[PDB]
Amino acid sequence: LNEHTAGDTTKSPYTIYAGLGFAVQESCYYCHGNGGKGTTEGLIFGVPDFTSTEFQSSMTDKQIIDHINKGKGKCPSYQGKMSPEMIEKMAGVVRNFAVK
């Protein structure tokens, strides 16, 4: 993955994760907040723990990208809602909850 390095917040995956341009219920932080561990609402829906090395070892980089495009169940599909380059940055954000 081409990891996102710090830059203008209007071009940042974190701004998208925090819900820019999205309804609250379609914003990652709403379900995957609390530092990637899951919010109350996300846990009701069964979100995984992005900070867990166990979860991270359950997906390849490509599978994270494919997931963000396609969605699964209550995790929405985001293909056509952000660019492919942004989805790849977002996959790096998912990875980065589990490392220092």
Partner: protein, 110 residues
Amino acid sequence: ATQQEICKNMWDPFQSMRAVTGLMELTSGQCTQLSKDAAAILAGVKESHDSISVDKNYKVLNDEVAYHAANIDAAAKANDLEEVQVQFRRMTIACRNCHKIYKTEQRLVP
């Protein structure tokens, strides 16, 4: 220091900066305060970055506040208040991004 202590210390500089973004002005004394406020925020997010060991995202979120704080200091030195205004809006989003991702269920400013 805890994150709560670090951010509490940034709140007055943040407000002092906000108060000046709605001016037309260029007072040398107001650039002094503005540069000092930008330095306080840069120092705060660097202290968080270096001493609050969370994860890599937490580091990049601090870096993106710092990105815009440094741009505000540059724009102030060049007396470009439109740029000060836009960069301060973007810095505010950068503060909020961390709050929404890491303290999702607490109402926080800004």
